[PDB]
Amino acid sequence: MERFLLNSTVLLYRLSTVSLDEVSLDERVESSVFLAQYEQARSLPDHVAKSAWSYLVQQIKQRNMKLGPVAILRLIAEKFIKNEKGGPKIDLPMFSEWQTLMSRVSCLPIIACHQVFNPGPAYSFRWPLYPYHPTVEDYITRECLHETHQHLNGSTSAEECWLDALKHPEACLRDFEKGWASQEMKQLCAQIDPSLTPRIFKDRLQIACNIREILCRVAQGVELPEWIASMQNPQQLANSTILHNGREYGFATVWPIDDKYSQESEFCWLTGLLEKWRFNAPEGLERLLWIYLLIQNQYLTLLVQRTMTELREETEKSYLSRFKHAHGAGVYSQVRYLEGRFAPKSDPNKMQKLLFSVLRGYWEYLSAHMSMEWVHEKPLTISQVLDNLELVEPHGKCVELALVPHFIKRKPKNGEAYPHALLFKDLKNQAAILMDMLKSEPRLTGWIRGVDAAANEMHAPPELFCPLFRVLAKSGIAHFTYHVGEDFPHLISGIRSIDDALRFLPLRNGDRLGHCTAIGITPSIWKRSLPLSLSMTKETRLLDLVFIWRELRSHPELLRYASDAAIEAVRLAHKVFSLEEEVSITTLDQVFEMRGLLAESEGLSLWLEEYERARELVKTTGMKRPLKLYKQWLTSDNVRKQRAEYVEVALEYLPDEAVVALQQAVMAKMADRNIAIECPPTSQYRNVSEHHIFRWMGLPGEAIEGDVPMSICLGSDDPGIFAADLKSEFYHLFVVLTRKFGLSPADALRKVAEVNENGRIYRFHDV
Amino acid sequence: MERFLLNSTVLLYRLSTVSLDEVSLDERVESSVFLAQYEQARSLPDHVAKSAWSYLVQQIKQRNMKLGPVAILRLIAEKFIKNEKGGPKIDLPMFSEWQTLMSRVSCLPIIACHQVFNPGPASQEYSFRWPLYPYHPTVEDYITRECLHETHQHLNGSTSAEECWLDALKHPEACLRDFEKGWASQEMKQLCAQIDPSLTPRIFKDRLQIACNIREILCRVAQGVELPEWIASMQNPQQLANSTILHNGREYGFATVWPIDDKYSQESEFCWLTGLLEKWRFNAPEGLERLLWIYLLIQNQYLTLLVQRTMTELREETEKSYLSRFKHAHGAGVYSQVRYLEGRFAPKSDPNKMQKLLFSVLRGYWEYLSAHMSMEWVHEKPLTISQVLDNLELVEPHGKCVELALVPHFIKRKPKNGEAYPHALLFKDLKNQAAILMDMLKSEPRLTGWIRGVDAAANEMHAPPELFCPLFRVLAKSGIAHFTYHVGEDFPHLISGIRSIDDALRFLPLRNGDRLGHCTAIGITPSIWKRSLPLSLSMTKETRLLDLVFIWRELRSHPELLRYASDAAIEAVRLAHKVFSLEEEVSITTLDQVFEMRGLLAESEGLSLWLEEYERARELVKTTGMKRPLKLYKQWLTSDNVRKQRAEYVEVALEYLPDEAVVALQQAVMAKMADRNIAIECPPTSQYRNVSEHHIFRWMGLPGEAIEGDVPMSICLGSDDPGIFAADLKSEFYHLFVVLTRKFGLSPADALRKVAEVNENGRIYRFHDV
Ligand SMILES: [Zn+2]
Ligand SMILES: [Zn+2]
């Protein structure tokens, strides 16, 4: 119940609107807590919450504390954090609950409270907090961890974004406004905080900054400036100055550290504040701290559930911190092979800019861990940085960087020559910039290893990126990645998407796909709160039917489903194409195997190959009707409208057995082509023990009879947590395996280590 | 996605605040739909909702309809309702979804839309009937042959929540009075905030008035009467919050003439809605369609609030609500669908009010019987309970009509801040109510043939079963056969619920053939009981100590659970050490002795018909060896320190006992229940995603749901669904049949056998006079 006192819209609104001298707010903190719990965790049976709150008040009163941030943080810290061996650590039995808490609350206040009220032996702040197990620590020391999936909030944890926003409040406000005009965002803001708006966003950021300044004053114990008396209502802090009597006083003060917005500075200030408030605290200032914590947690929730603030990460600072953080606190790095994913810029200048920043941050990180003749002691250009980096040997002391540009897929627009024409364009320009960079500096092929296409699945199919990936392969880009199976209108649709990626993308031996959740999630736990009928687009429906037919043709036990899929596919094609003649499932298959062709090749230097790739097709005398049908599929306005049309499909359209058969067919294809799956920990899972990673790892009770191993790799990407790490996810998997599956530490370590080593085996780094 | 357009706080607020001539509200209906879906069904993965809404707009546009109540109702009706055999029915494959929908939307508009846009043969004059059932010849034949038996009907009075809407419209100021007197209560403020944040009594009143005014206006257009002139002044739905509209200087009332004498009846509502939809068959004015939308939204919001929850109930103290109850329990045929009906009512603390309620119930029953049999009735117009009983003595149990068995409640309330012993004032109020009941039974001995049972319902945690034992014993002697007591419904822990059921068994005077209640604690599995629960649950120290003692008692003899028994004993001794502030040593044996005396009346000897249990403690105080248990129990009852420690809270791990141990405790309680031949009334009800996970199937012994060491327990049926509008015993019977046939693969015959066994348990364990 402690999380609802640190993350609550109702509590924030109430505390920020009433005066600072109101006193006696217990009734209201309690009511707001129940509202927050109903809004967030609805399934609590309405009396467990009452009892938990009663126990919380009982603990506070017995320990002679007041309901407030200090007491809540103390309780959380005593319950989760200790001291063991080196620095604070989390209980092994409590790590899962700690992760769930981290999805709502920031860890820095809790660690400050632990350092104040239960310090270890007579610490530099480090996030996140890990558990301790000698087997896991020895394995990490010996083999190190390998990162293959880091693309969530840029590549930094959401917790430094709070301080970045406080540093650039007007950049953050600019981004929020430019994106609040977007519907997606209005809906998200309403779902988190109904009455948010950009104006209260700005006011909350300013209130947080002013509260931070005031509480820094009391943390240092400096004289409580006089204008504090005029401060009566927290809304007064929404502004850059306070008016006491005629005068306008600023909230700024002096800070010890040069960077006052750094997490070290935040930790120092919080530790000092809690040390001064060890025994008690003023009610008003404690409420100010409460409001600051609530604002921070609300901002982090909004951020995790989501260009410019990202542009501000285009210096050799965010990347240097990234590499220093991937490296542990020891001499030898915790992370050996790091894949760094960045959005490619449409401006050659901005692209050169981003890449110079990344490479120079990496070089500085290396210079802080090895001493050598660096040629250019102060590199200024990518060429100089590469001259520096050529001297670095893969000894294994530090991280080894492999850069992977993204490709963001956007939804098709109202009017274009063919679907995703403008998107394919923008991708073309980005790829052109990348290829010109690789040309003008061939050595950049040793650091740019891979083109990943992330973003929403439904916005662009895999077949759209095939020409781009082929051209990049020739421009010198080894290894390809493509997000598949993450979000799908239907499980069959996701499995079909993975199969299309396999049979259309130029994935070679050792390449990695992505999440591939559609072939890991079971049909049993995929339809748990879903409506009995799901609506999809006609194009996806037809492609799914064709895929079902293709995969269940040879299955003696599923021939009925294959035949029904064929019949439905022919029918749906009959309207989608407005065909008068008869089209068989065979010719439908022929039509849909040509999706990998470039649209503007021959049916609508390095690009020449796939400009003429269609000529072979148009040469084959028997490929008439597939060709004309595909041209209708691409250009015909009627066919495009019918493609965007929607149709309903039953949830049990195919039985669990048939869905598992399709999943296992895709599994077999993946194993045959030796394609790995980067699986980070992520809606339908109540508990982490239901995650499909365990099915893939082959745990008894989770693996299905006809499953095939698939070379799972690890990735540090948790959509809804603050301050996550590769070590954190490794420890989470270890804890789940040891406690929920009963595996011994050695067996659990073997299972997690196999995935981790898959990261190294299927790394994109230059050998 | 159609439910979010008929039940949505955001949509209601938006539609009721913007002007009636705004036009083009699709963007906003869509946004509000997504907000409503996030608030209600959060687990939809944020794109299934987008796609469903896109398909909905596609259907509306293709069928040339406008986004509005008419289109939504038409879609729902085509999707769920048909015509088969007699009247409209629901698909067998669609009945589960229809029930889930009924938890949010009222069925009357949908049935009106079905009757308008897809009527059955024009030979069966359709009279509106709720609820809509599926059709299966096996189930219908079974119902015709054996009839259905009701053993649990105490939820919203005893009527469906859907007639309460019209009752509120009939008595808006009674409903407003109740809402205000109860909005001062915290429980209620929290509930109102959780349903509609900015509800307040004032907007409650305004919404009721808006609904009434919209009903009047739409009745005018349903009859097609001249659209009175003041409609032009009506520009903003908030104008309808008031009893009159001001056009130019004048104040015009919204009332009009209605065909039927009772304009607030469900027949009148159905007629008006059918006429309105017939007139709007092809199109509708945007403003009036929005008024209908607002009316539907207000009705659904009110029903949601009502189902999730004295005076409006007092207004059910005439021989009308009970007559309708009996007519509804009786089907539309000559022979009643329901054979043995148990009627549960709250006993009044005023002898006048109690006589009043009972005369109303008995006279309603007599009128219902008079409408189905012709006989010499002695008093053609009974005025007193004696005359009604003279009438009813002539009725033979032929089986044509319902047979009534009345069961007074006993509402348990939380203990108050200061009293002699816990629940002293509650035990008092129960004492006065029981005294009134006994004086009634005296002054009319024939009332023992109609008052058969004293049930104690209400919240479990507010009063333990041991508090009602003296009351039940005294009532048993006053002539009250059969006893009932709600147990296992809500518990801080599963062990606590199982312990509560065991305490009810070993303390209440439950004889052979008695029924307990829900008893969910011994039906819900430990696997699906901890699914969204925190790893630590906090309880009171008294419950913790009693649970530890119960664990020890039940796992003493279990060779595989001796470790858990020993740990429970040790923890019990420890917790007793502070709770009692004891300096000496107290063993688990003497703790058991202390806690077996909870059935004693507090004010017997340690603090006419009551004489027996006033002296029941004398035997205890006579036993020379019962010293330390007695003094310890006296400390437990009176000591302020012990009472504060009892109210204290302590945390218990969710996996304090393994699933195996919890199942062992459940099966021990099962064996006790089977040995004492105590039945369980199980109505359909938080941790179940789908109905197939309900514990009724475990009790019925379905493969995959029953556990190895389970014991059959004589489950009876009850029509009590906490979160549905317009539910029935037939509806629940059909729901069980559908689940058994579709989700468990059982043939119609096997499913009918399984449901029929529970239904027949209702008759076997009936409280009716033989
Ligand atoms: Zn990803
Ligand atoms: Zn009940």
Side-chain angles (χ1 to χ4, degrees), chain A residues 46 117 120 175 213 346 360 392 633 640 730 743:
Chain A
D46 190 39
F117 295 96
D175 273 323
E213 297 291 12
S346 267
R360 201 207 208 288
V392 175
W633 175 271
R640 278 178 50 190
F730 193 96
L743 271 67

Side-chain angles (χ1 to χ4, degrees), chain B residues 457-598:
Chain B
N459 192 318
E460 299 212 44
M461 286 174 206
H462 285 24
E466 41 264 16
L467 182 84
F468 289 85
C469 297
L471 215 79
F472 281 14
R473 282 188 232 107
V474 176
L475 282 155
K477 296 176 218 112
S478 101
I480 287 285
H482 308 109
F483 295 95
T484 306
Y485 189 110
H486 282 61
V487 280
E489 257 204 281
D490 54 78
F491 35 84
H493 206 281
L494 196 47
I495 301 156
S496 279
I498 303 156
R499 187 251 330 160
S500 298
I501 294 151
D502 177 6
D503 289 1
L505 281 165
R506 71 187 199 117
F507 289 126
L508 291 168
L510 299 166
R511 305 188 252 174
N512 191 338
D514 280 348
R515 314 185 238 120
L516 259 181
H518 295 232
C519 297
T520 306
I522 58 166
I524 196 158
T525 69
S527 165
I528 173 168
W529 163 74
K530 42 198 195 57
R531 263 191 192 175
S532 61
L533 259 59
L535 276 309
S536 279
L537 301 165
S538 85
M539 56 184 41
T540 59
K541 291 210 173 123
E542 72 186 299
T543 58
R544 188 26 172 187
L545 183 52
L546 292 166
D547 296 342
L548 291 163
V549 171
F550 166 77
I551 290 159
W552 177 71
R553 284 167 59 84
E554 297 314 322
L555 303 181
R556 269 165 342 185
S557 54
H558 273 84
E560 314 76 17
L561 307 163
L562 283 173
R563 194 184 100 246
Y564 305 114
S566 317
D567 312 334
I570 294 164
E571 297 176 356
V573 172
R574 186 171 348 219
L575 193 60
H577 276 312
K578 354 149 198 197
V579 166
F580 284 107
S581 272
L582 272 180
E583 277 290 31
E584 314 76 358
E585 182 140 36
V586 59
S587 46
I588 192 68
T589 25
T590 171
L591 269 186
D592 192 60
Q593 271 173 47
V594 173
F595 295 139
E596 283 183 71
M597 306 177 352
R598 302 183 267 145

Side-chain angles (χ1 to χ4, degrees), chain B residues 595-609:
Chain B
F595 295 139
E596 283 183 71
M597 306 177 352
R598 302 183 267 145
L600 298 187
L601 185 64
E603 49 212 341
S604 51
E605 285 260 338
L607 197 145
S608 192
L609 291 168

Side-chain angles (χ1 to χ4, degrees), chain A residues 35 52 87 107 123 160 201 229 271 278 285 337 378 393 397 427 436 447 466 557 567 633 654 660 677 693 706:
Chain A
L35 273 89
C107 70
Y123 178 75
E160 322 188 322
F201 186 89
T271 38
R278 168 161 255 150
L285 299 183
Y337 287 116
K378 191 150 180 352
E393 259 166 346
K397 190 147 147 174
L427 299 168
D436 299 79
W447 303 101
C466 297
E557 314 76 17
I567 294 165
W633 175 271
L654 277 194
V660 161
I677 293 159
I693 189 144

Side-chain angles (χ1 to χ4, degrees), chain A residues 417-607:
Chain A
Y418 54 101
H420 313 103
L422 307 171
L423 173 60
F424 189 84
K425 202 185 275 325
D426 194 61
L427 299 168
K428 223 184 147 178
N429 185 43
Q430 287 164 14
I433 296 175
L434 192 60
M435 298 180 245
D436 299 79
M437 293 214 53
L438 299 180
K439 280 291 197 258
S440 92
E441 190 59 73
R443 281 173 312 183
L444 268 153
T445 49
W447 303 101
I448 304 190
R449 293 292 229 192
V451 289
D452 169 60
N456 192 318
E457 299 212 44
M458 286 174 206
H459 285 24
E463 41 264 16
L464 182 84
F465 289 85
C466 297
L468 215 79
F469 281 14
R470 283 188 232 107
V471 176
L472 282 155
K474 296 176 218 112
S475 101
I477 287 285
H479 308 109
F480 295 95
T481 306
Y482 189 110
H483 282 61
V484 280
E486 257 204 281
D487 55 78
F488 35 84
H490 206 281
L491 196 47
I492 301 156
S493 279
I495 303 156
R496 187 251 330 160
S497 298
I498 294 151
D499 177 6
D500 289 1
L502 281 165
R503 71 187 199 117
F504 289 126
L505 291 168
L507 299 166
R508 305 188 252 174
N509 191 338
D511 280 348
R512 314 185 238 119
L513 258 181
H515 295 232
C516 297
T517 306
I519 57 166
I521 196 158
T522 69
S524 165
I525 173 168
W526 163 74
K527 42 198 195 57
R528 263 191 192 175
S529 61
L530 259 59
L532 276 309
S533 279
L534 301 165
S535 85
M536 56 184 41
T537 59
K538 291 210 173 123
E539 72 186 299
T540 58
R541 188 26 172 187
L542 183 52
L543 292 166
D544 296 342
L545 291 163
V546 171
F547 166 77
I548 290 159
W549 177 71
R550 284 167 59 84
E551 297 314 322
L552 303 181
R553 269 165 342 185
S554 54
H555 273 84
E557 314 76 17
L558 307 163
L559 283 173
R560 194 184 100 246
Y561 305 114
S563 317
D564 312 334
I567 294 165
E568 297 175 356
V570 172
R571 186 171 348 219
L572 193 60
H574 276 312
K575 354 149 198 197
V576 167
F577 284 107
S578 272
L579 272 180
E580 277 290 31
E581 314 76 358
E582 182 140 36
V583 59
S584 46
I585 192 68
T586 25
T587 171
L588 269 186
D589 192 60
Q590 271 173 47
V591 173
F592 294 139
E593 283 183 71
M594 306 177 352
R595 302 182 267 145
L597 298 187
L598 185 64
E600 49 212 341
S601 51
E602 285 260 338
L604 197 145
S605 192
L606 291 168
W607 287 95

